[PDB]
């Protein structure tokens, strides 16, 4: 638990943004949100509208917040989401082209 | 040219299992997507076609069935020609009865077995 600098603004800040620390652990700086980690499938969205439940790469699911920019278009299940399991947060999704649609029609 | 050789085990079909249920998919579609290439040809062989499930084998991708029937006595006669070649040794008997003929000895010996097994 941080204490935020008088020159950052503690309500400008969004859920999921990765912030900068110093050697005091104080929070002067936040930066954007991650782009590289684990792609977990979405399988459900819960009732909260904060958490999601997904699925890891070793059919081990998890629950984990959603970010703020995942908080038209709708998210829907079977979507591909990069997370940080010790984290717990989802910050962005990886578009994914499906073949199935295709070979149906 | 890929040469899928007993496609019994693979591909075969996915209702009756009793991942190889994720098998025929991918393939169908790598299949559609090197369709357009005119040199590619793929060529499949298998003993049960029934076990094949129609989809990889509906007009498209396996559009050509070709059916090895059984041997006949022209067919036989043919097939003992290319084993039964004047090469092997002969002996004496048979072949002093066509004066040394090694092609018209072995030829009637063909003619002779063929009709001694389809009789």
């Not at chain 1, 603004?9 to 943004?17: N, Y």
């Not at chain 2, 029934?50 to 070709?66: E, H, N, Q, T």
Request: hydrophobic letters at 45%; a negative charge.
């Amino acid at each position: 638990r941080l204490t935020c600098s008088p020159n950052i603004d503690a309500a400008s800040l969004k859920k999921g943004q990765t912030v900068r620390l110093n050697e005091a652990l104080t929070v002067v700086e936040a930066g954007t949100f991650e782009a590289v980690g684990e792609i977990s499938t979405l399988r459900e969205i819960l009732a909260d509208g904060h958490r999601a439940l997904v699925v890891g790469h070793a059919d081990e699911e998890r629950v984990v917040w959603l970010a703020d920019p995942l908080i038209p278009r709708k998210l829907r299940p079977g979507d591909s989401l990069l997370v940080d399991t010790k984290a717990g947060y989802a910050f962005e999704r990886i578009p994914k082209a499906e073949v199935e649609d295709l070979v149906l029609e | 040219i890929v040469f899928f050789d007993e496609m019994d085990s693979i591909f075969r079909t996915r209702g009756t299992g009793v991942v190889e249920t994720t098998v025929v998919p991918q393939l169908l579609s790598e299949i559609d997507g090197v369709e357009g290439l005119e040199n590619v040809i793929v060529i499949g062989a298998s003993n049960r076609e029934d076990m094949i499930d129609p989809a990889i084998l509906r007009p498209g991708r396996l559009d050509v069935k070709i059916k090895i029937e059984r041997p006949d006595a022209e067919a036989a006669q043919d097939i003992y020609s290319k084993y039964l070649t004047e090469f092997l040794p002969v002996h004496a008997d048979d072949l002093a009865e066509f004066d040394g003929d090694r092609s018209a000895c072995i030829k009637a010996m063909i003619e002779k077995v063929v009709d001694r097994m389809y009789a």
